[PDB]
């Protein structure tokens, strides 16, 4: 019944699943502005206890030059290190309690058509949903150091790798004007740690609009059934060209390409790990 | 256009792709009877030059007890070693020219409904399509040591791993009564070698008939779209059960199970590597 409706829904769309996957090519464009603190400072401006810019294992790799707040952690989803502070509670050796409270970030008032209805935080590590929360506040509450309420995130994707935590904007009261992140890592097992980046509201376009019908896409035959309008990379008729994307199921390779997963969300279920879209670029 | 028709075709089937994947659970049931030689002897009864039962790398692993002709190579697709001779041209150290000509095998005269229209050989290694051929003959030709003609196989699947070579039965003349395998491995590069097992005509049932709608199946959400009638393994409503199958795209994991790929073929394109069906059993 569910299976049957899913498939009927799929076939009823001109370009199948490509119309339902929403792609966020520029996660930095959606970042919330800090209320008072400079961008570099805002992520840890409230409190940081044993959360540091390099508190993340090399293997969740590492960049030569540090990002804005000193992190050499390689960031996912084409997050720009020069515009993306990172704080994490991982460390080698002696494990200690760790906590984070960011400064306040401003929620949008200016409407934008191309936004997903989600507050998103790119995060890594292993943690329970209660350990990372989004607090909200009015101007008055924030000024007095209080918050009006809080929510948890849906943790979507495989841990401890980088992934996008999602919180439906619908849960945030309409009078809230500011939000902040709070994290609590009291679990001293070495494998239990948290890394966060600042909050954003994704600006998105459909995968069909982003990928189109001309860019060649690496994908399994099975997976391609759901993406009828995408051009499958192959060599029929002696075709020779450069693949530009790869689509993967949720759970290189001919030509030495770098594959970068781009942030994406399924319109039909914002908490579903649908699979992955990756942009391919010459490894050079 | 192709994409669109594929997807419309998919959705038009009650159980989607499950009706088009044909599964061969018992490859030994389809094995051709040798004309004159005992089963153990027939695979190398004509000529074997540097083709041996253990001429296959451990990593294409290995079994404790040898199979019928002395091979400790672990066989794929639930081939029964006690009924499946193997001969291969791989070796360490000094590389030598290698050739194989099997004895004659009898083509069926008794009709069977559940057969795929293919002559199949399970093979491993790296080789060109010209290096492995199927020869056919009438009784008269075979008796005189001649053959009436020959064909190549479609090599479907990733090399050098085990896979199923396929030759359409339609290509074999109606007067042919016997077939044999011939292989030529003159390439002395160590990575270039061939391993073969005897010819068969697969007995098959649809994946829908084999897997059904009750056995839980491990599969990616994306892949499941094409298999609407299969029960996806998960824990919704606190469901606790043992997964029995896994379906994979063409290009563990929660509970310590052994995964065994079963032989399968896509009815719509016998040369397409559609993906894989695996049977799961307790690793114990
Ligand atoms: C079983 C149908 C075989 C048709 C011939 C090759 C079909 C290729 O099929 C692939 O390409 C399509 C996208 O255009 C997509 O539906 C599928 O993954
Ligand atoms: C976007 C639709 C979300 C519906 C709620 C969960 C859907 C689960 O979807 C999975 O199960 C189906 C097989 O029954 C198959 O179509 C799909 O892979
Ligand atoms: Ca910890
Ligand atoms: Ca060789």
The structural domains of chain B, with segments of one domain joined by +, span: 1-25+204-284, 26-203
- Is residue A84 within 8 angstroms of chain B, CB to CB? no
Ligand closest to Cα of A184 equals 3
> Could B228 and A274 be called an inter-chain contact, meaning their C-beta atoms sit closer than 8 Å?
no
> Could B249 and A223 be called an inter-chain contact, meaning their C-beta atoms sit closer than 8 Å?
yes
Q: Is A135 helix (H, G, I), strand (E, B) or coil?
A: strand
Chain A CB contacts of B223 under 8 Å are 222-223, 249
Q: Residues lining ligand 1, CB < 6 A?
A: A 221, 224-225, 228, 232; B 2-3, 6, 268-269
- Longest pairwise C-alpha distance within chain A: 69
Resolution (in Å) of the shown entry?
2.0
Distance CA A219, CA A246 (A): 6
- Is residue A228 within 8 angstroms of chain B, CB to CB? yes
Residue to mutate, B219, B225, B229, B275, ligand 2, most ligand atoms under 8 Å from C-beta: B225
User: By CA distance, what is B218's nearest residue in A?
Assistant: A251
Q: Does domain B26-203 have CATH number 3.30.720.210?
A: no
| β-strand pairing of A163-168 with B21-24 | unpaired
> Could B230 and A7 be called an inter-chain contact, meaning their C-beta atoms sit closer than 8 Å?
no
Where do we find the tokens 């992140």? A181
Q: Which residues of B97-133 are buried (b: 16+ CB within 10 A; e: fewer)?
A: ebbbbbbbbebeeeeeeebbebbbbbbbbbbeeebbb
> Could B220 and A3 be called an inter-chain contact, meaning their C-beta atoms sit closer than 8 Å?
no
Q: Does domain A1-25+204-284 have CATH number 3.90.330.10?
A: no
**Ion ligand 3 — residues with CB < 5 Å:** A 185, 187, 192-193
For residue B3, give how far its alpha carbon lies from the nearest alpha carbon of chain A (Å): 4
**Which technique was used to obtain these atomic coordinates?**
X-ray
Q: Is A69 helix (H, G, I), strand (E, B) or coil?
A: coil
For ligand 2, atom 6, which residue shows the shortest CA distance?
A2
**Ion ligand 4 — residues with CB < 5 Å:** B 185, 187, 192-193
For residue A160, give how far its alpha carbon lies from the nearest alpha carbon of chain B (Å): 16
- Is residue A4 within 8 angstroms of chain B, CB to CB? yes
d(CA B256, ligand 2 centre) in Å: 25
Comparing CA positions, the residue from B110, B101, B103, B120 lying closest to residue B31 is B120
To the nearest 10 degrees (0 to 180), the angle between helices A2-12 and B2-12 is 150
Is B103:B178 a contact under the CB 8 Å cutoff? Answer: no
For residue A57, give how far its alpha carbon lies from the nearest alpha carbon of chain B (Å): 24
Burial class (CB in 10 A: 0-12, 13-18, 19+), B168: middle
Sheet holding B216-218, edge to edge: B205-206, B21-24, B257-266, B276-282, B245-248, B216-218, B231-232
- Is residue B233 within 8 angstroms of chain A, CB to CB? no
Distance CA B196, CA B162 (A): 9
Comparing CA positions, the residue from A159, A172, A194 lying closest to residue A52 is A194
Indicate the helix (H) or strand (E) that contains A133.
strand A132-137
């Amino acid at each position: 019944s569910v299976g049957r409706s899913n498939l009927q829904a799929l076939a009823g769309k001109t370009c199948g699943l490509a119309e339902d996957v929403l792609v966020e090519l520029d996660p930095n464009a959606g970042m919330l502005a800090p209320v008072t603190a400079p961008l570099a400072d805002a992520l840890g401006a409230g409190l940081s206890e044993a959360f540091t810019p390099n508190g993340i294992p090399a293997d969740v790799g590492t960049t030569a030059a540090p990002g804005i707040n000193g992190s050499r952690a390689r960031l996912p989803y084409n997050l720009d290190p020069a515009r993306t502070p990172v704080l994490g509670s991982w460390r080698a050796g002696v494990q200690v309690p760790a906590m984070l409270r960011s400064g306040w970030y401003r929620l949008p008032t200016n409407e934008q058509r191309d936004r997903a209805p989600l507050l998103v935080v790119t995060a890594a590590g292993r943690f329970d949903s209660r350990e990372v929360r989004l607090q909200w506040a009015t101007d008055e509450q924030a000024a007095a150091g209080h918050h009006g309420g809080s929510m948890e995130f849906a943790d979507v994707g495989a841990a401890p790798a980088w992934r996008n935590l999602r919180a439906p904007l619908s849960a945030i009261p309409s009078t809230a004007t500011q939000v902040r992140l709070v994290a609590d890592d009291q679990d001293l097992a070495p494998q239990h740690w948290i890394a966060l980046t600042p909050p954003r509201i994704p600006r998105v376009r459909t995968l069909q609009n982003v990928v189109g019908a001309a860019d060649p896409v690496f994908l399994d035959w099975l997976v391609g059934l759901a993406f009828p309008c995408q051009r499958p990379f192959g060599h029929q008729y002696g075709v020779d060209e450069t693949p530009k994307w790869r689509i993967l199921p949720d759970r290189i390779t001919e030509l030495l390409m770098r594959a970068t997963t781009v942030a994406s969300y399924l319109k039909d279920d914002w908490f579903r790990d649908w699979g992955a879209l990756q942009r391919l670029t010459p490894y050079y």
